[PDB]
Amino acid sequence: PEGLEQLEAQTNFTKRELQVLYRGFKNECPSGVVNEDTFKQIYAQFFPHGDASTYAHYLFNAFDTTQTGSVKFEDFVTALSILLRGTVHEKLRWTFNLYDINKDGYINKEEMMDIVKAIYDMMGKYTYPVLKEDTPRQHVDVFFQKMDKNKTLDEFLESCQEDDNIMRSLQLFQNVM
Template sequence: TCSTLLGLCAPPDTSDSELELSMVRHQPEGLEQLQAQTKFTKMELQSLYRGFKNECPSGLVDEDTFKLIYAQFFPQGDATTYAHFLFNAFDADGNGAICFEDFVVGLSILLRGTVQEKLKWAFNLYDINKDGYITKEEMLAIMKSIYDMMGRHTYPLLREDAPLEHVERFFQKMDRNQDGVVTIDEFLETCQKDENIMSSMQLFENVI
């Protein structure tokens, strides 16, 4: 999975040269520190960085560029809204740009993280306004954006109200105390106990 984002940084080779930190205006953190922060090896980080640098010589990816990348991978639908949400999830410090550190730390979680780490990252994606809670409206916005991105003709049997039905079913399970919002604890507990939700989370992984 995560082939879309990996396409952004497909390495031209896998030689074991040092990171060419002086080649970009925005320099990533030291190699050792990134190794400690992620679950990538030194060689993997070097390859990822070379690919990232080739695609983004400035060392930064802004939201417009991110949307263009997603549009190329999902030409059958409209990826604009989902790319917006995903960009905000990767932009950890909220400064409007994804640097190599943001990218590789998020990628490490999605590719090699534990179930809990992946679910926490997913919670952050669904928590659009970053207030620590997921509302039904936020979950619906994410779900609609995924359906839009995949394209109507990709799933011709889906009705227009399919995203809403999907969200209603999930939200009822997740909002365990019925207070109208889903907390991180409710999200983690429900997802890990419900096989249907966990299998549906694979859709999330497939569009990363």
């Protein structure tokens, strides 16, 4: 919480970029900390077709390390820096912990059952295929078909790196902000 401490010191934001983020961050939450209730208000504005509160709840937990209850600006930026301008390795662990709802690191097709459901839920019911009750399960089933060899963290890292198509999608937003 200095401005120079979170400078280009394992934080991928410059001094001017840090100033812009804090002006926007404190604009919505003047107290300097944003909580889960407010964390869903901004996210739901970007996706008005459905409700993003279900996905924001899992997103907030990933941002809120140590389950403090409120996510501060110091560790809010380092989450943005890892996700936006971070390296390959840091992005995958952050996403792995986003799917890993519980404490220990494992994915068992029930923990991320809600994750894919939240992605489909936040589109509302207005799409061309009119969706389906079992369409989130099909997306999970095909997702496990490419990494789940037998029944982990090491598997997730090697599977994403094996397919270059997901590789070029992770680095989508580093060039523009």
